[PDB]
Design a protein around this nucleic acid. Structure first.
Length: 78
DNA sequence: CGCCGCGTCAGACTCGTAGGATTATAGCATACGTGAGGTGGGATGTCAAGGCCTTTTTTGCCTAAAATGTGATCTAGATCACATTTTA
């Protein structure tokens, strides 16, 4: 599953590899959200998988950029 | 053996001049801890009157005793117009 959907991970990743942090870190975090979605996904919902891990990936990257990527940590609320 | 290609590595010295950055990234719910706020409470620190001792300020006082007064009786100084008289 994971080795299959790596291209989803990288595709979504490089929408956000504008000069925020760096490519490969967005990619790696994307693989983390991917592994979550593989751990959680239900076939019985019968939907496509792409959407599910799209959400999960996007969460993971979207707050790893914010936790990291600065010398001064601004937490999520600000 | 002797190229050839690729790569590594230095490029003078002291002063001055200016301020200075930027893109876009979801959203709400749970639940937990830490910062700025209260809060009585030991405990410390202050400020105004009183009891131990010595010193200081009044102040007794203690007797040597030298000093302070009594006043009629004197005394040895002190004067002034005339008559010379001396000395530089």
């Amino acid at each position: 599953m994971v080795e299959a959907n790596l291209r989803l991970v990288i595709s979504i990743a490089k929408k956000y590899t504008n000069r925020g942090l760096q490519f490969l870190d967005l990619i790696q975090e994307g693989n983390i959200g991917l592994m979550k979605a593989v751990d959680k996904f239900e076939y019985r919902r019968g939907y496509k998988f792409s959407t599910y891990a799209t959400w999960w990936i996007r969460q993971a990257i979207t707050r790893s950029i914010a936790d990291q990527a600065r010398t001064i940590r601004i937490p999520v609320h600000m």
